[PDB]
Design an enzyme around this catalytic site. Sequence first.
Site, PDB file in Angstrom:
ATOM      1  N   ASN A  84      20.532 -36.401  -7.997  1.00 20.16           N
ATOM      2  CA  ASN A  84      20.287 -36.283  -6.554  1.00 20.16           C
ATOM      3  C   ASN A  84      19.676 -34.956  -6.172  1.00 20.16           C
ATOM      4  O   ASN A  84      19.728 -34.556  -5.001  1.00 20.16           O
ATOM      5  CB  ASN A  84      21.582 -36.506  -5.763  1.00 20.16           C
ATOM      6  N   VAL A  91      18.135 -30.433  -2.510  1.00 18.71           N
ATOM      7  CA  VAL A  91      19.285 -31.330  -2.614  1.00 18.71           C
ATOM      8  C   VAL A  91      19.152 -32.530  -1.688  1.00 18.71           C
ATOM      9  O   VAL A  91      18.853 -32.368  -0.510  1.00 18.71           O
ATOM     10  CB  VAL A  91      20.577 -30.585  -2.259  1.00 18.71           C
ATOM     11  N   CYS A  92      19.390 -33.723  -2.229  1.00 22.93           N
ATOM     12  CA  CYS A  92      19.387 -34.955  -1.457  1.00 22.93           C
ATOM     13  C   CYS A  92      20.842 -35.369  -1.214  1.00 22.93           C
ATOM     14  O   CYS A  92      21.552 -35.725  -2.147  1.00 22.93           O
ATOM     15  CB  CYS A  92      18.602 -36.026  -2.211  1.00 22.93           C
ATOM     16  N   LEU A  93      21.267 -35.299   0.043  1.00 15.57           N
ATOM     17  CA  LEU A  93      22.669 -35.505   0.422  1.00 15.57           C
ATOM     18  C   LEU A  93      22.661 -35.877   1.904  1.00 15.57           C
ATOM     19  O   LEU A  93      21.992 -35.227   2.697  1.00 15.57           O
ATOM     20  CB  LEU A  93      23.473 -34.228   0.176  1.00 15.57           C
TER      21      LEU A  93
END
Length: 156
Positions: A84, A91-93
């Site tokens: 992710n 950051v992918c969140l």
Amino acid sequence: SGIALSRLAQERKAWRKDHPFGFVAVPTKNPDGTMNLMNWECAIPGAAGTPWAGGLFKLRMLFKDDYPSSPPKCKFEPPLFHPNVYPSGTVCLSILEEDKDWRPAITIKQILLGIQELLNEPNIQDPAQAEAYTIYCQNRVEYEKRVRAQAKKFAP
Ligand SMILES: S=c1[nH]c2cc(Cl)ccc2o1
């Protein structure tokens, strides 16, 4: 900029008073040497008893002028192997997207703890980089081997 700067001063005060052990979060400086609250240098320690243990993972937190309307951009520098994390380091969140789960009340501490949790528990519905995602899906033993090697590489 007053709204963001006021909130960022509040975050800095709170962070310095009480933060999770081994984490770092410090504003940078402008070219004239004054404090730049819009750009912070952070570090997240790997959790003990996990493949991330012993690593200290540096991340930059970049705030837009409309913060806390918007979440900060959080970017591992250097980029990390993780399903992710984009190859750029970003950051992918979901809590880090304005149109998903970001809420203005979310603190810097909550962001960094959220990213620490992400490190040890990827979201497979949300792949950001092909390699780590593919290995996580195909061979969890190899995946963890790669994570352990990375943690050693970034031992403090
Ligand atoms: S030293 C040092 N450089 C650095 C850069 C980032 Cl983005 C975060 C933590 C850091 O510590």
